[PDB]
Amino acid sequence: AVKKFKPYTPSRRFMTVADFSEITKTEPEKSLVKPLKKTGGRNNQGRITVRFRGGGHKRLYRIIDFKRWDKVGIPAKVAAIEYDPNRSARIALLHYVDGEKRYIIAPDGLQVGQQVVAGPDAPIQVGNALPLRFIPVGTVVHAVELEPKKGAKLARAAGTSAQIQGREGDYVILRLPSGELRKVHGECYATVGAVGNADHKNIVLGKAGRSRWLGRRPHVRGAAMNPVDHPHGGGEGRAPRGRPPASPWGWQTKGLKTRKRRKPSSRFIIAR
Amino acid sequence: MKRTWQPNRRKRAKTHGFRARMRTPGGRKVLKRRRQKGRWRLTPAVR
RNA sequence: CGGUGAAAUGCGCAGAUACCGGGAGGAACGCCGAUGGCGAAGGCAGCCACCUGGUCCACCCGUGACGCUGAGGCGCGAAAGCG
RNA sequence: AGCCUACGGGCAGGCGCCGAGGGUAGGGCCCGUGACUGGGGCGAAGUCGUAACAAGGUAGCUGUACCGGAAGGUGCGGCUGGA
RNA sequence: CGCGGGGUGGAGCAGCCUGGUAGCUCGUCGGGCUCAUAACCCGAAGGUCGUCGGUUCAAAUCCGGCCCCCGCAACCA
RNA sequence: GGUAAAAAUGUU
RNA sequence: UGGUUCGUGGAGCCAUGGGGGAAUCUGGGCGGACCACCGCCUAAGGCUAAGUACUCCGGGUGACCGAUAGCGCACCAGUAC
RNA sequence: GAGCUAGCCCUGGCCAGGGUGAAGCUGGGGUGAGACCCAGUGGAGGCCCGAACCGGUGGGGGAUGCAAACCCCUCGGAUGA
RNA sequence: GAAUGCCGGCAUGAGUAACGAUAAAGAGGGUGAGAAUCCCUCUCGCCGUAAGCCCAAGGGUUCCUACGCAAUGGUCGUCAGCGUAGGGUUAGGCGGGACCUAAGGUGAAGCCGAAAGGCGUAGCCGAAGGGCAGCCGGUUAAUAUUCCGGCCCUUCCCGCAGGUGCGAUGGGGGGACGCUCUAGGCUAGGGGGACCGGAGCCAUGGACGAGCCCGGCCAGAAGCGCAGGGUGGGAGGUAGGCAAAUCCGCCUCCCAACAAGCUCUGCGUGGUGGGGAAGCCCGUACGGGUGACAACCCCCCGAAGCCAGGGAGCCAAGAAAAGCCUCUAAGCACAACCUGCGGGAACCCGUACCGCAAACCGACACAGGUGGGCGGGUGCAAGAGCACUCAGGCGCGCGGGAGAACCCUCGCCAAGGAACUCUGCAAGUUGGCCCCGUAACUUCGGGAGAAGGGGUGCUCCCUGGGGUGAUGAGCCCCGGGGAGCCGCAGUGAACAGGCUCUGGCGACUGUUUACCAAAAACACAGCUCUCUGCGAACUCGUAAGAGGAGGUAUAGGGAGCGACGCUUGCCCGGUGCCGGAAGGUCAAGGGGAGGGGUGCAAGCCCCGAACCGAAGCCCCGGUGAACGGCGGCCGUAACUAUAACGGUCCUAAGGUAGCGAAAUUCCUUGUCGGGUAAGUUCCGACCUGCACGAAAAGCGUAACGACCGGAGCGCUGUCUCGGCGAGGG
RNA sequence: CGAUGUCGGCUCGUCGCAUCCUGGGGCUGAAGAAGGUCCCAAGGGUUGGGCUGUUCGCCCAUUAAAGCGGCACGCGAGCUG
Ligand SMILES: [Mg+2]
Ligand SMILES: [Mg+2]
Ligand SMILES: [Mg+2]
Ligand SMILES: [Mg+2]
Ligand SMILES: [Mg+2]
Ligand SMILES: [Mg+2]
Ligand SMILES: [Mg+2]
Ligand SMILES: [Mg+2]
Ligand SMILES: [Mg+2]
Ligand SMILES: [Mg+2]
Ligand SMILES: [Mg+2]
Ligand SMILES: [Mg+2]
Ligand SMILES: [Mg+2]
Ligand SMILES: [Mg+2]
Ligand SMILES: [Mg+2]
Ligand SMILES: [Mg+2]
Ligand SMILES: [Mg+2]
Ligand SMILES: [Mg+2]
Ligand SMILES: [Mg+2]
Ligand SMILES: [Mg+2]
Ligand SMILES: [Mg+2]
Ligand SMILES: [Mg+2]
Ligand SMILES: [Mg+2]
Ligand SMILES: [Mg+2]
Ligand SMILES: [Mg+2]
Ligand SMILES: [Mg+2]
Ligand SMILES: [Mg+2]
Ligand SMILES: [Mg+2]
Ligand SMILES: [Mg+2]
Ligand SMILES: [Mg+2]
Ligand SMILES: [Mg+2]
Ligand SMILES: [Mg+2]
Ligand SMILES: [Mg+2]
Ligand SMILES: [Mg+2]
Ligand SMILES: [Mg+2]
Ligand SMILES: [Mg+2]
Ligand SMILES: [Mg+2]
Ligand SMILES: [Mg+2]
Ligand SMILES: [Mg+2]
Ligand SMILES: [Mg+2]
Ligand SMILES: [Mg+2]
Ligand SMILES: [Mg+2]
Ligand SMILES: [Mg+2]
Ligand SMILES: [Mg+2]
Ligand SMILES: [Mg+2]
Ligand SMILES: [Mg+2]
Ligand SMILES: [Mg+2]
Ligand SMILES: [Mg+2]
Ligand SMILES: [Mg+2]
Ligand SMILES: [Mg+2]
Ligand SMILES: [Mg+2]
Ligand SMILES: [Mg+2]
Ligand SMILES: [Mg+2]
Ligand SMILES: [Mg+2]
Ligand SMILES: [Mg+2]
Ligand SMILES: [Mg+2]
Ligand SMILES: [Mg+2]
Ligand SMILES: [Mg+2]
Ligand SMILES: [Mg+2]
Ligand SMILES: [Mg+2]
Ligand SMILES: [Mg+2]
Ligand SMILES: [Mg+2]
Ligand SMILES: [Mg+2]
Ligand SMILES: [Mg+2]
Ligand SMILES: [Mg+2]
Ligand SMILES: [Mg+2]
Ligand SMILES: [Mg+2]
Ligand SMILES: [Mg+2]
Ligand SMILES: [Mg+2]
Ligand SMILES: [Mg+2]
Ligand SMILES: [Mg+2]
Ligand SMILES: [Mg+2]
Ligand SMILES: [Mg+2]
Ligand SMILES: [Mg+2]
Ligand SMILES: [Mg+2]
Ligand SMILES: [Mg+2]
Ligand SMILES: [Mg+2]
Ligand SMILES: [Mg+2]
Ligand SMILES: [Mg+2]
Ligand SMILES: [Mg+2]
Ligand SMILES: [Mg+2]
Ligand SMILES: [Mg+2]
Ligand SMILES: [Mg+2]
Ligand SMILES: [Mg+2]
Ligand SMILES: [Mg+2]
Ligand SMILES: [Mg+2]
Ligand SMILES: [Mg+2]
Ligand SMILES: [Mg+2]
Ligand SMILES: [Mg+2]
Ligand SMILES: [Mg+2]
Ligand SMILES: [Mg+2]
Ligand SMILES: [Mg+2]
Ligand SMILES: [Mg+2]
Ligand SMILES: [Mg+2]
Ligand SMILES: [Mg+2]
Ligand SMILES: [Mg+2]
Ligand SMILES: [Mg+2]
Ligand SMILES: [Mg+2]
Ligand SMILES: [Mg+2]
Ligand SMILES: [Mg+2]
Ligand SMILES: [Mg+2]
Ligand SMILES: [Mg+2]
Ligand SMILES: [Mg+2]
Ligand SMILES: [Mg+2]
Ligand SMILES: [Mg+2]
Ligand SMILES: [Mg+2]
Ligand SMILES: [Mg+2]
Ligand SMILES: [Mg+2]
Ligand SMILES: [Mg+2]
Ligand SMILES: [Mg+2]
Ligand SMILES: [Mg+2]
Ligand SMILES: [Mg+2]
Ligand SMILES: [Mg+2]
Ligand SMILES: [Mg+2]
Ligand SMILES: [Mg+2]
Ligand SMILES: [Mg+2]
Ligand SMILES: [Mg+2]
Ligand SMILES: [Mg+2]
Ligand SMILES: [Mg+2]
Ligand SMILES: [Mg+2]
Ligand SMILES: [Mg+2]
Ligand SMILES: [Mg+2]
Ligand SMILES: [Mg+2]
Ligand SMILES: [Mg+2]
Ligand SMILES: [Mg+2]
Ligand SMILES: [Mg+2]
Ligand SMILES: [Mg+2]
Ligand SMILES: [Mg+2]
Ligand SMILES: [Mg+2]
Ligand SMILES: [Mg+2]
Ligand SMILES: [Mg+2]
Ligand SMILES: [Mg+2]
Ligand SMILES: [Mg+2]
Ligand SMILES: [Mg+2]
Ligand SMILES: [Mg+2]
Ligand SMILES: [Mg+2]
Ligand SMILES: [Mg+2]
Ligand SMILES: [Mg+2]
Ligand SMILES: [Mg+2]
Ligand SMILES: [Mg+2]
Ligand SMILES: [Mg+2]
Ligand SMILES: [Mg+2]
Ligand SMILES: [Mg+2]
Ligand SMILES: [Mg+2]
Ligand SMILES: [Mg+2]
Ligand SMILES: [Mg+2]
Ligand SMILES: [Mg+2]
Ligand SMILES: [Mg+2]
Ligand SMILES: [Mg+2]
Ligand SMILES: [Mg+2]
Ligand SMILES: [Mg+2]
Ligand SMILES: [Mg+2]
Ligand SMILES: [Mg+2]
Ligand SMILES: [Mg+2]
Ligand SMILES: [Mg+2]
Ligand SMILES: [Mg+2]
Ligand SMILES: [Mg+2]
Ligand SMILES: [Mg+2]
Ligand SMILES: [Mg+2]
Ligand SMILES: [Mg+2]
Ligand SMILES: [Mg+2]
Ligand SMILES: [Mg+2]
Ligand SMILES: [Mg+2]
Ligand SMILES: [Mg+2]
Ligand SMILES: [Mg+2]
Ligand SMILES: [Mg+2]
Ligand SMILES: [Mg+2]
Ligand SMILES: [Mg+2]
Ligand SMILES: [Mg+2]
Ligand SMILES: [Mg+2]
Ligand SMILES: [Mg+2]
Ligand SMILES: [Mg+2]
Ligand SMILES: [Mg+2]
Ligand SMILES: [Mg+2]
Ligand SMILES: [Mg+2]
Ligand SMILES: [Mg+2]
Ligand SMILES: [Mg+2]
Ligand SMILES: [Mg+2]
Ligand SMILES: [Mg+2]
Ligand SMILES: [Mg+2]
Ligand SMILES: [Mg+2]
Ligand SMILES: [Mg+2]
Ligand SMILES: [Mg+2]
Ligand SMILES: [Mg+2]
Ligand SMILES: [Mg+2]
Ligand SMILES: [Mg+2]
Ligand SMILES: [Mg+2]
Ligand SMILES: [Mg+2]
Ligand SMILES: [Mg+2]
Ligand SMILES: [Mg+2]
Ligand SMILES: [Mg+2]
Ligand SMILES: [Mg+2]
Ligand SMILES: [Mg+2]
Ligand SMILES: [Mg+2]
Ligand SMILES: [Mg+2]
Ligand SMILES: [Mg+2]
Ligand SMILES: [Mg+2]
Ligand SMILES: [Mg+2]
Ligand SMILES: [Mg+2]
Ligand SMILES: [Mg+2]
Ligand SMILES: [Mg+2]
Ligand SMILES: [Mg+2]
Ligand SMILES: [Mg+2]
Ligand SMILES: [Mg+2]
Ligand SMILES: [Mg+2]
Ligand SMILES: [Mg+2]
Ligand SMILES: [Mg+2]
Ligand SMILES: [Mg+2]
Ligand SMILES: [Mg+2]
Ligand SMILES: [Mg+2]
Ligand SMILES: [Mg+2]
Ligand SMILES: [Mg+2]
Ligand SMILES: [Mg+2]
Ligand SMILES: [Mg+2]
Ligand SMILES: [Mg+2]
Ligand SMILES: [Mg+2]
Ligand SMILES: [Mg+2]
C-alpha cells in the first residue's frame, strides 16, 4: 500500500514511502525492558572497518524477545504494532497474562487483539512459536533458531519466510529465503507465518539524502581512484578494469567463493 | 584565514601534560631526557 | 544411448540409456467425452467447499403497457506484448 | 485672449473619451519552397531467389512477437476460404 | 626513410622452415541428364612461381639489388 | 479417421 | 633453526620450537659424518670473592684551549628566543 | 602531533523576510457502488527569490602586499547530503 | 681572496619606496623647556543587525591613581594598552566542585601479548547536557545578582510540638526529549496622546497656540485574578518487574469522564522599597546639584521569548544516570521518617581588565579569522535588507602644499552602435511592488519572473471589510471608485533579473584539487553481476577483542553502470572464476627391492628403486551487466556508377540495432544545404566511421548548470578615437 | 642549462630594395585608351570587415596600391595569454 508522491520537486516523482496503516496508534515506545541506549559507531576500537557508514538519524534499540521459550504455555495479547528503526520488519507489542511486556517481531497478517502463545502445545496459528519437530511439514515459518537454545537467527527480515520440507531423525529440512536447504535441529523454536511488511522491497529512496538518513555515506567506485587506493584505479581516462575485478584488498569479486571449506556446518547443508 | 594555533587549556594539559606523559612509556622517556638535559620546565606551562 | 528417410551434432566406462526405491518442483487434467453442455461474446474441462450470475419448466397467483432498438458514454474483451 | 444680430447666449479656440490607421511584441491557420530521406506508381525484354495457386513439393490465411538480402522463416493462440 | 609479412594457372589459397617432385576449391573446355537452363555426373586442359643477378650438380624454396602490396612505427621539447 | 513423408527456373 | 671461523658443507660440538622417547657404573656425553680400538669428562638443581669495564662526583697533572677558541653555557644557560 | 585540516561519535546552538500551494481533511458533483471532477481548507519540498551564515564563478586591484591567498564589484547555496 | 662558505661589523640602492583602508577635518583656550598629534569648548564628518552594549573561549596587570619620556608608538608627544611605585578582583542564592550520567577515557573480575603493553563486564572519571535556592536599586578613582538597602529563598544540624510502621546503592513511576507548521492568553520591546509633570523658548516673514522641547518607570512575598501544563478514584484477583512489596504491570465487573477536583508554573495585581529627563548653574580628565512633593495615566502594534511536558501533521522514529514520588528487604519499631516553628552551621576555586579586537589566533597598535544574547526610530510591500539617525562609540597615530605625465577607484559624452576581441572579457541595459498577458516542448510538476506590456508621486471627496474597544468613538491593518495639482522624470535618493533562439556533456540539489583547475570529473537515487546460512562474508589487530550487528537473503560485503525512456546483438579459442570422488604429474611422510662403510662377529651407521602418497597444475565441461574480441582478397545488374548476389581464404566468432567529419575524422576548411555582404567556428544532412557502438554502456530525453560552443534583439568608451572632469597616489 | 621566457595579437617603430602604388624612361606582336616586360627610383603612402589562436590563406566591399623581407621568425624589466 506504498505511498507515491507527485513530481512537485525533482526526486519526489520517484520517491517512495512505506505504508504505516498497520502501525496502530502507538507512535511512542514502551520502556524499562524496551529501548536501551544504542551506540552509534561506524568503526571498532580505532580504525574504520566497514567503510561508508556514518551520519544518519538517531535511534533507540527496541529490545526484542528472540528466545521465546521463556514463557512456554503462557499466552499473550497483541496490543500494538510499532515502528522499529533498527529493522526492516515491524514489531508487535505483547502483553502477557503473566504480566510481562515484550516485543516479538511482527509476522504478516497478525492483527491487534489476538491470543498468541509459545511452546510445544501451541496451535498452528500465525505468531505462535513451536519446536520445528512439532510444526507440520509444508508450513511457512520464520524467526528460526539455528542451534537450539541460542536465539532466533534465521528468516527475520521484512517479508522473508522459511518453509519446512521434511524431517530426518532429530533434524528437519528447511528451505531458506536463499533457497538453501538446511538441516536444523528439531528442538529449535520457530514462529509460524511470514514476516510481512513485504512491500519493503518496493521502496524507492528517491534522492541521495534519504540514503544519508539511513546512515549510508556515499560509496566511491574503485575505478574513480588512484592505484595506491584500489586495484581498479589509475589510468588516463576511464580504464576498463585492466584485470579480473577485485576489491580494494585484492581478492576477486566476480564469482570467487570464500566460504571456509572445512567448516563443520557443511554437513548440514544440502543446497546453494 | 584561520591559523594553526587555536589555544585551549583543556587540550593542552590533557595532551602535553605531566599525567599524559607518565601513562605511556614514550612520555616517561620524554621527561627523562628533560631531567637529564636540565630543563626548567618538564611540561608545557598550563594554568 | 538419443535421433533420422539415412545420418550427424549431442549424452555416455568420470558408470549413461534401460530398472527399482525415496525426495523436490512446476504445469496440464487421461478414461468419462461427443456433431454433448454453458455463456452476450472472447471463451469455459481432475475434485471439494464458499460466494455469485444468466437461464429452462410447471402453477396461471400479483403489478399492470412498465416495451423494442440504441448516435455517444460506460464495462467486458483470445493469443502475442509491456510494467 | 479674440468675434457677434436681441448676451445668466452663440462662434472661433482649448481639454477629454471613442477613434481609421501606423508601430512594437507574441500566438494560431494555410500556401509555396527546401539539402537530404522514406515509401508509392508507371515504365526497356535487367539482377537474385520460389513465397502463394494442385498436399505448390513445410496445408493456407491471420492478429501479435522476434529474426533474416529478399519474398519470407519460426513461436503463441485462432480460422476453413484445407485433409 | 625504419621494422615485419607477402607476390604461385582466369579468381582466391597452400607448398618455402628441412633445395630434387607444384596441390586444393571455384572457374574454363569436351561429353552426359533436360524440351531447355541452372544444379548434378564423367573426362581434360592450363602455372616464364613479380623481376634482375649467384649459391649449388640442381632454386617456387637459399642469398642479395630493385618494382609493387599489407600491417606497424614516425617520440621528447 | 482418434493415427505417416521427398529437390529451382521458362522473353513478350 | 640459532651460536661457534663454519653461509648445508664430509657438519660434529653447544643451545633449542615440534614428534617419538630410555637407562643409574655392565650407567651415560665427547674427542668434527660414521664404525672399531685407545683415551677425556660425569649433563638434565644452585651460590661463589679477587683480578675486569665505566666516570654523575672529589683530587692531581698537561710540548690541552685562551671569550668566533675551550663544554651548548668563564657572564645566574639548557636561559632568552 | 587530528588546538590546522579530512572523517565519524556524544552534546548544545543557528538559519530575517517574502513567494509556490503536494498530500490530506470538509462540502458539493458524479456512480449501482466506485474511480474520478470541482471548490474551500491545508502547508509538503536535497522547492523558488533573498540577508545572517557557509562558499569562492568572472573581472579589476594587490605582487619587498593590509595579507606567506588579501580587498572591491559581481556570483552559487541558503529546511538541508 | 674566492667554497650562492660560517659568524660579526659597516657600506650601496637613498634621503629613494613607504608611513598599513579616500570615514574628514577647522578654530579658540589651557598645560608645557618644547604642541597639527595631550586636555577642554564650539563647529564638521563616520558607524549605528555596529565601527554600539552584555557573555564564553583565550590573554594574564594590560584595570585605577600618582610621578615620568631614554626605548616601544611607522612622525610628534607634556599622551598611552609604555617605565617606577601604590591601590584594586569581597558570594549559601552567579559559574564550577564536596550531585548525576553521554561519546570517549580508565578499569577490581576475566581474556591476551617475546618484554614494553593490548582489550575488558560492574565501578569510577568524564559537560555549555540533566539537577539546583535572588530579584531591584545605591555606593568606589578602580569591585558588586559578591559590599550596602528593601523584599524573598535553599541546604544541613540540634531542640521541643503534632502525625506515620519507619527504613536501602534494591523494585517501579518520573526525569524523558525528533523535525516542520501552528492555536489561545500573556510578557519583552515599540509607537501615539487633546491627559498628567516640567526648567524654559517666541528667533528671521508669520504663530501665545489642544504651541515647541523633554519625560510620563522598575522590582515586589502571602493573598486573590486571568491564562495554561500535568494527572483518573475505589474494590478484589495476580504466576511478571531475577529476595520481598500495599508500588508498578496484566485481568475483572463498578462509579468519573470531566481538567469538576487536587497540585504545578507563567503573567498581572499586590505590604512596601527604588528610580526619575530635557534644560540651567558649575571646579576637575570625570561628575555634582537644582529642575521634582516630579508626573508616574490612557490607547494601539506585538514577538522567534513565557504558559511547555500545548496542539496538528510527517518519517528519517527521535540520549543516559541522579535529584524527585512511591514500594517493600534486612534491621529497627526508647529508634527512625514526614509536617510546622525556633535557634545554630553554611566550606574550596573564579570574579579586575580587553573580548569581531591596539590586550585573543596571525613575528607587527597587520584592511585577515573568531561562538552565544540585546541590537531603538522613520520611510521604502516585508525584513536582521537599504538610506538617514537615537543611546553609545569613533574620524582608522605622519602632515602641509601643489593641481604635470602615468596608475588606481569613479562620473559624463557628439555620430555610429560589437566594426574591439580568443570571447560583448569588462562596463552598461534590465531592475522592487501591483495588474494584464505569456510559445514550442513536457516525465503534466513544469517551462514561468517565459517573452512583451501598463500602472507607481501629491491633494480633495465618496465608500467596502476587518482587529482592539461594548454593538460606537478613537487607534491599527487591508481595499474600491471619482475629481484634480506639479515636474524632464513619481520603487523621483539607496537597496533590486538584460532577454531570446539553438546545440555539446552531465539527469537533477549536492562534492572536490585549503594556496593557479568547480568541470563533462566525484557523488547520487536507480539497474545488474557476485559473495555471504551467522562464531556469516568482509575489515582492523600477532593474539584477545571489536566493527559488520546487538543486523539475519526484502539483510550485509565487493565490483561496475549511473534519473527516466527504448534497448543492451555474436565469440568460452587464450586469461579469470565456477563445477568435475576418473586419469597424468606432484612434496614431506610410509615403503623397502638392492648396494655401500666399519667390526672377529652379535651389531652399529649411511644411501636407496618399484609401490601407496594432498592441494595445485595438466585434462573435461560451463560462465560475458567476468578479463576481452567482434576479418581479407576477387567478380557481378536492361549507359556509366554502385553491388542486393556469388566465388575463395582465414577465424573462437567475423560490429546487429542505434548513431556517425562527432569531446571520436589523419587526408580536411570532406561535400551538399541553412545563418552572413563575406562563416577553418555553429546548426541540418551524405557516409568514403585513418581510429562510434551497446552497463570502461548505446541512442534519446522535459526540467536543471557561476560548465562549453553558435546566433539574434536590447544596451553600452569594447572599438572607430579619443576627450573632459573627480578623488587617492 | 648557478636560466638568453617560445607562437600569435596589441602598442611603438626603424631599416633593406630584389618596388605594390604614385614619379621618369627603353622595347612591345605599343593605333588610342588600357596592358605586357624591363631599366632608374625608395620621398611618401600601402584601407575596413567575415572565418580561424593563428602566422599564412580564402572570401566580402573598396582602392592609386592593399609590396616583400630584416631588426633574438624586432618588441612579454611595454601589455595581452
Ligand atoms: Mg527505572
Ligand atoms: Mg574503547
Ligand atoms: Mg585508543
Ligand atoms: Mg559511486
Ligand atoms: Mg582520478
Ligand atoms: Mg594513503
Ligand atoms: Mg594496485
Ligand atoms: Mg582512452
Ligand atoms: Mg585499470
Ligand atoms: Mg577539542
Ligand atoms: Mg392472474
Ligand atoms: Mg486482451
Ligand atoms: Mg497472455
Ligand atoms: Mg510478465
Ligand atoms: Mg441666463
Ligand atoms: Mg508456404
Ligand atoms: Mg513454393
Ligand atoms: Mg507451402
Ligand atoms: Mg528462425
Ligand atoms: Mg498455428
Ligand atoms: Mg479428411
Ligand atoms: Mg598465399
Ligand atoms: Mg604462399
Ligand atoms: Mg561443359
Ligand atoms: Mg545443363
Ligand atoms: Mg618532456
Ligand atoms: Mg616521454
Ligand atoms: Mg607531446
Ligand atoms: Mg531466375
Ligand atoms: Mg648458522
Ligand atoms: Mg650451524
Ligand atoms: Mg653459499
Ligand atoms: Mg655445523
Ligand atoms: Mg628437542
Ligand atoms: Mg649431548
Ligand atoms: Mg650427539
Ligand atoms: Mg671430547
Ligand atoms: Mg661423537
Ligand atoms: Mg675423530
Ligand atoms: Mg671431555
Ligand atoms: Mg652439579
Ligand atoms: Mg670482565
Ligand atoms: Mg674531575
Ligand atoms: Mg663560546
Ligand atoms: Mg679578545
Ligand atoms: Mg658556543
Ligand atoms: Mg577537528
Ligand atoms: Mg544571530
Ligand atoms: Mg519561507
Ligand atoms: Mg486541497
Ligand atoms: Mg514552506
Ligand atoms: Mg532550497
Ligand atoms: Mg537554483
Ligand atoms: Mg538564494
Ligand atoms: Mg569560517
Ligand atoms: Mg571547499
Ligand atoms: Mg574572488
Ligand atoms: Mg585575481
Ligand atoms: Mg571582509
Ligand atoms: Mg541565482
Ligand atoms: Mg672570505
Ligand atoms: Mg654577511
Ligand atoms: Mg646609504
Ligand atoms: Mg627629495
Ligand atoms: Mg620627505
Ligand atoms: Mg631612484
Ligand atoms: Mg620618486
Ligand atoms: Mg611617496
Ligand atoms: Mg599606521
Ligand atoms: Mg594609518
Ligand atoms: Mg604656560
Ligand atoms: Mg551617517
Ligand atoms: Mg567557560
Ligand atoms: Mg579568563
Ligand atoms: Mg599577546
Ligand atoms: Mg606591566
Ligand atoms: Mg600624568
Ligand atoms: Mg617615549
Ligand atoms: Mg627614565
Ligand atoms: Mg617617537
Ligand atoms: Mg612637560
Ligand atoms: Mg589605562
Ligand atoms: Mg602603566
Ligand atoms: Mg563535607
Ligand atoms: Mg570540605
Ligand atoms: Mg558536577
Ligand atoms: Mg564527581
Ligand atoms: Mg559518576
Ligand atoms: Mg567503559
Ligand atoms: Mg604485566
Ligand atoms: Mg585500557
Ligand atoms: Mg553542568
Ligand atoms: Mg548545567
Ligand atoms: Mg545555581
Ligand atoms: Mg568597570
Ligand atoms: Mg547591582
Ligand atoms: Mg543582600
Ligand atoms: Mg512506608
Ligand atoms: Mg531506579
Ligand atoms: Mg514593563
Ligand atoms: Mg509597554
Ligand atoms: Mg503641558
Ligand atoms: Mg519675525
Ligand atoms: Mg511615549
Ligand atoms: Mg483504577
Ligand atoms: Mg517476587
Ligand atoms: Mg477536559
Ligand atoms: Mg507588577
Ligand atoms: Mg503574585
Ligand atoms: Mg537627578
Ligand atoms: Mg550632565
Ligand atoms: Mg506536544
Ligand atoms: Mg532511563
Ligand atoms: Mg550511578
Ligand atoms: Mg512524581
Ligand atoms: Mg567581577
Ligand atoms: Mg567585570
Ligand atoms: Mg559578536
Ligand atoms: Mg603573517
Ligand atoms: Mg607597527
Ligand atoms: Mg595582534
Ligand atoms: Mg603584541
Ligand atoms: Mg593603527
Ligand atoms: Mg586587526
Ligand atoms: Mg562569525
Ligand atoms: Mg528589533
Ligand atoms: Mg530598523
Ligand atoms: Mg517599519
Ligand atoms: Mg513617501
Ligand atoms: Mg522592501
Ligand atoms: Mg532579533
Ligand atoms: Mg546595513
Ligand atoms: Mg554623538
Ligand atoms: Mg550633465
Ligand atoms: Mg557616446
Ligand atoms: Mg546619443
Ligand atoms: Mg541600436
Ligand atoms: Mg568581429
Ligand atoms: Mg579585427
Ligand atoms: Mg562566441
Ligand atoms: Mg559580463
Ligand atoms: Mg536604470
Ligand atoms: Mg529551452
Ligand atoms: Mg504555471
Ligand atoms: Mg515581467
Ligand atoms: Mg527559455
Ligand atoms: Mg510632489
Ligand atoms: Mg492585543
Ligand atoms: Mg471583538
Ligand atoms: Mg506620468
Ligand atoms: Mg536598482
Ligand atoms: Mg546556452
Ligand atoms: Mg560540437
Ligand atoms: Mg551536474
Ligand atoms: Mg585550488
Ligand atoms: Mg599548492
Ligand atoms: Mg578557481
Ligand atoms: Mg559550481
Ligand atoms: Mg537506469
Ligand atoms: Mg584496530
Ligand atoms: Mg590476520
Ligand atoms: Mg563479532
Ligand atoms: Mg551491534
Ligand atoms: Mg546484496
Ligand atoms: Mg550492496
Ligand atoms: Mg560514469
Ligand atoms: Mg521521452
Ligand atoms: Mg570452453
Ligand atoms: Mg572467451
Ligand atoms: Mg573460459
Ligand atoms: Mg578447479
Ligand atoms: Mg620418498
Ligand atoms: Mg625415505
Ligand atoms: Mg627409513
Ligand atoms: Mg591431487
Ligand atoms: Mg555485451
Ligand atoms: Mg558493368
Ligand atoms: Mg562473401
Ligand atoms: Mg550479429
Ligand atoms: Mg562541418
Ligand atoms: Mg558550408
Ligand atoms: Mg553559405
Ligand atoms: Mg554537423
Ligand atoms: Mg560522415
Ligand atoms: Mg575514431
Ligand atoms: Mg566509447
Ligand atoms: Mg570502444
Ligand atoms: Mg561494455
Ligand atoms: Mg554515461
Ligand atoms: Mg547522445
Ligand atoms: Mg544519456
Ligand atoms: Mg538534453
Ligand atoms: Mg556549473
Ligand atoms: Mg550545482
Ligand atoms: Mg558575429
Ligand atoms: Mg575609454
Ligand atoms: Mg584622464
Ligand atoms: Mg586627480
Ligand atoms: Mg640554456
Ligand atoms: Mg656551472
Ligand atoms: Mg648568470
Ligand atoms: Mg633598383
Ligand atoms: Mg611605375
Ligand atoms: Mg611607369
Ligand atoms: Mg614603359
Ligand atoms: Mg598607350
Ligand atoms: Mg572569431
Ligand atoms: Mg611562425
Ligand atoms: Mg617591416
Ligand atoms: Mg628562423
Ligand atoms: Mg620574436
Ligand atoms: Mg609579462
Ligand atoms: Mg609575445
Ligand atoms: Mg624585453
Ligand atoms: Mg630583458
Ligand atoms: Mg592558454
Ligand atoms: Mg585564460
Residue numbers in the entry:
A (entry chain RD): 2 to 273
B (entry chain R7): 1 to 47
Paper passage:
During protein synthesis, ribosomes select correct aminoacyl-tRNAs (aa-tRNAs) by monitoring the nucleotide (nt) pairing between the anticodon of the tRNA and the codon on the mRNA in the aminoacyl (A) site. Decoding is thought to be governed by a conformational transition in the ribosome—open (off) to closed (on)—that occurs upon codon–anticodon pairing in the A site. Ribosomal ambiguity (ram) mutations increase miscoding and map to disparate regions, consistent with a role for ribosome dynamics in decoding, yet precisely how these mutations act has been unclear. Here, we solved crystal structures of 70S ribosomes harboring 16S ram mutations G299A and G347U in the absence A-site tRNA (A-tRNA) and in the presence of a near-cognate anticodon stem-loop (ASL).
To better understand how each of the ram mutations impact ribosome conformation, we solved structures of programmed ribosomes containing P-site tRNAfMet and lacking A-site tRNA. In the 70S-G347U complex, determined at 3.2-Å resolution, B8 is disrupted, with h8 too distant from h14 to form the triple base pair. Additionally, the 30S shoulder domain is rotated inward, which brings G530 closer to A1492 of h44. Although G530 is closer to A1492, it does not undergo the syn to anti conformational change that normally accompanies A-site tRNA binding. In other words, mutation G347U alone primes the ribosome for tRNA acceptance by shifting the conformational equilibrium of the ribosome toward the closed (on) state. Nucleotide G347 normally participates in a base triple interaction with C342 of h14 and A160 of h8. Mutation G347U disrupts this base triple and consequently B8. In the 70S-G347U structure, the 30S shoulder is rotated inward and intersubunit bridge B8 is disrupted. In the absence of A-site tRNA, the mutant ribosomes exhibit a partially closed (on) conformation, with the 30S shoulder rotated inward.
